[PDB]
Each structure stands twice: as structure tokens, then as C-alpha cells.
Amino acid sequence: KDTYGFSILDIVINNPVNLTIHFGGEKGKRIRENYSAMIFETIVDGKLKTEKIFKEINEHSTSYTFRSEKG
Amino acid sequence: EQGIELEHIDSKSEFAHRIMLTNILRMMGCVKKQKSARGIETRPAQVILPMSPNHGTFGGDGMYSESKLSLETLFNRWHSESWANQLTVCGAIIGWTRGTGLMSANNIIAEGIEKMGVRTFSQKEMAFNLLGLLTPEVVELCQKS
Known part of the structure; x- marks a missing residue:
């Protein structure tokens, strides 16, 4: 909840098909x-090449939806 | 509320004040309660409050001025209470907008007002002004204060 804005308990109990995380306000x-x-922190030719998980999340993103077919 | 001076403030003005103040606070409160019941702390609703430069300047408008001035408390209450994560406050001080239910009775003089180097607005322009408050940059600003 505090770090990624979702409840692992909510996902276990309700198994939602999609989950939108909102980035509104200071907490967001x-x-x-x-x-x-x-x-991702990889070493290529003795150089730290940091890549991003969640490419679609930038400083102008207001939300991110996790998607599934069934849950 | 037209032709309602202080001494005429009665049923209609109390009802108008309920619409234009009290039940706005209740509506905001309801949204706050729904969001909080669902643990929504990161998706605040921007409240575009229709504020007025008319705080008893024209007269004869019942409790209009009281309704509009009272909305200005929300600017401080946002900091002092526990609803800031659910609601943001955007006070629009709406200028002289021709053609509306409240202002159509004042359209004939607007050319004269503009001769002072001042601006009256069409509903289209005012709408454009207010839609400017819902742009991503103003939305982020209201989330800060």
C-alpha cells in the first residue's frame, strides 16, 4: 500500500481482473x-546500464493499470 | 435571487443558500466519505468552486453573496481538516459572463463596462477559462495547495 499503492490482501481476497494505481497527490x-x-541494474563493458521496468510510467503519468484476462 | 434585499431574505434565499453553499459542502463531504470508505488516498477530486467578485456589491440578491463568500473558507479548511487527499480546491472567481440564468438581466450595459478597458465574457470564453483549470498542470497545482 505505502510503496506501490495496492493491497496484496485485496488481490488475494477479490482477485480483480485489472488494478489501476493512481499517482495523485503527494502520496501518489x-x-x-x-x-x-x-x-534493472546490468553491467555491460564495465558500465552500469540502468533500464526501467514500467516504461509507460513517467513524471506526467496519473495512473498505471495492471492487466489480466481472468484475475 | 433578484430584488431580495436584507429585509426580504426569506424562504427562497434560505433555500438558495442551501443549494449554493450548504449542499456543496455536503456533496464534497459525500465524495470524501466514499473515497475514504474505499481507501482512495491518491485520486483526489478537484472541486471547481464557482466563486464571485460579488460580495454584497450589487445588492438585492438575497443570500447570494453570503453563499459565494462562504465558499472561500474551503481554501483554509483544505489545510486544517483531514480531506485534502480526497478533494482539491480550485476557486474560480468567475467574471461578468453574459447570457446565463443569473446574469442575463445585466447584458444591455456590457459594451459600456468594456469602454473602461475591462472584459466581460461569453459563456464559451468563460467555459474555456474554467476548462483551463482541468489541464494537467493546474490539476497538479491544486494537489499541492
């Missing part, structure tokens, strides 16, 4: 940062 910007700061 902090959660958005956590999604952005979530990075």
Missing part, C-alpha cells in the same frame, strides 16, 4: 517515484 507522487526508481 511518492508511489509513482517508487515505480520509476524500480530499475
Whole structure:
């Protein structure tokens, strides 16, 4: 809840098909940062090449939807 | 509320004040309660409040001025209470907008007012002004204060 803006309990109990995370307000910007700061840290030719998980999440994103067919 | 001075404030004005103030606070309150019941702390609703430069300047408008001035408390209440994550406050001080239910009775003089180097608005322009408050940059600004 505090880091990624979702309840793992909610997903276990309700198994929602989609989950939208909202990045509104101060708390939402902090959660958005956590999604952005979530990075792949690879070493290529003795150089740190940091890539982003959640490419579609930038500083102008207001939401992110996790998607599934069934849950 | 037209032709309702202080001494005429009665049923209609109390009802108008319920519409234009009290039940706006209740509507905001209801949205706050729904969001909080569902744990929504990161998707605040921007409240575009129809504020007025008319705080008893024209007269004869019942409790209009009281309704409009009372909305200005929300600017402070946003900081002092516990609803800031559910609602943001955007106070639009709406200028002289020709053609509306409230202002159509004042259309004939607007050319004269503009000779002072002042601006009256069409409903289209005012709508455009208010839609400017719902742009991503103003939305982010109201989330800060």
C-alpha cells in the first residue's frame, strides 16, 4: 500500500481482473517515484546500464493499470 | 435571487443558500466519505468552486453573496481538516459572463463596462477559462495547495 499503492490482501481476497494505481497527490507522487526508481541494474563493458521496468510510467503519468484476462 | 434585499431574505434565499453553499459542502463531504470508505488516498477530486467578485456589491440578491463568500473558507479548511487527499480546491472567481440564468438581466450595459478597458465574457470564453483549470498542470497545482 505505502510503496506501490495496492493491497496484496485485496488481490488475494477479490482477485480483480485489472488494478489501476493512481499517482495523485503527494502520496501518489511518492508511489509513482517508487515505480520509476524500480530499475534493472546490468553491467555491460564495465558500465552500469540502468533500464526501467514500467516504461509507460513517467513524471506526467496519473495512473498505471495492471492487466489480466481472468484475475 | 433578484430584488431580495436584507429585509426580504426569506424562504427562497434560505433555500438558495442551501443549494449554493450548504449542499456543496455536503456533496464534497459525500465524495470524501466514499473515497475514504474505499481507501482512495491518491485520486483526489478537484472541486471547481464557482466563486464571485460579488460580495454584497450589487445588492438585492438575497443570500447570494453570503453563499459565494462562504465558499472561500474551503481554501483554509483544505489545510486544517483531514480531506485534502480526497478533494482539491480550485476557486474560480468567475467574471461578468453574459447570457446565463443569473446574469442575463445585466447584458444591455456590457459594451459600456468594456469602454473602461475591462472584459466581460461569453459563456464559451468563460467555459474555456474554467476548462483551463482541468489541464494537467493546474490539476497538479491544486494537489499541492
